[PDB]
Amino acid sequence: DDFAKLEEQFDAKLGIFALDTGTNRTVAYRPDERFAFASTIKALTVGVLLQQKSIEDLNQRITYTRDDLVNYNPITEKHVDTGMTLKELADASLRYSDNAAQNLILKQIGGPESLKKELRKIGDEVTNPERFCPNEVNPGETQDTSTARALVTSLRAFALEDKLPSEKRELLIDWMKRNTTGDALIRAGVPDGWEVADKTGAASYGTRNDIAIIWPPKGDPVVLAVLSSRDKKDAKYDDKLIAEATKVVMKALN
């Protein structure tokens, strides 16, 4: 099988789940195996934020300090002086994977415990938010992990089904469509011209993730999660694994 070949080729473990929402055909490989979700959780966090707040309430200015800056703060490091609105924080979190922005958003929705509660409410019993900035340690722990199947199901719930009213659904989808961080991942494995909404993640042990909604020109979208990890803490990743895995998925569905 082509997925086993890629694990071999890239010295990594792959978790794959894809759902064609038109046919209900699926493509699965280790679909229920846990991986650190890393920044992919930002998408679900905004889904919860959008459930909590009116669109107008997203204009609430959030102030923060240099103390709130963490490992990677591409947008938030530029606005300590003014703060940023919740809307601008959601834009930073989703389109740049600004870690500080995610932290600020999580703080506003009541932290990981509160995020976990709201995910459970949409039917997600697997995803396990435990900490702000989900933190190295060891593989095996279920804290800050999910599965390809659960991330697909939760992303679909927010973005395409009924967990958000349509105007808020529109905001989430648009931010994800205009992601700047996933050019070499799922987007690189999809046919040209086909619109993609995605959120990437990356983490130690060579963890490299992308979750996405992919629209054919015409017809119902596919929802895909491609998760990966490696056995060494210091191992880096290769984006090409995710792109190639996506090509395998598209071939199996198309």
Ligand SMILES: *C(=O)[C@@H](NC(=O)/C(=N\OC)c1csc(N)n1)[C@@H]1N=C(C(=O)O)C(=C)CS1
């Ligand atoms: C999201 O995944 C986030 N990742 C991290 O901050 C890291 N771990 O999170 C548990 C991390 C960065 S470097 C390292 N060894 N671990 C931000 N997301 C992306 C992304 O592409 O989405 C990054 C590339 C890094 S920073």
Ligand SMILES: CC(=O)c1ccc2cc(N(C)C)ccc2c1
């Ligand atoms: C945002 C944050 O609090 C945080 C904390 C510890 C981290 C450790 C890392 N490695 C050991 C690689 C990487 C990112 C990290 C981010």
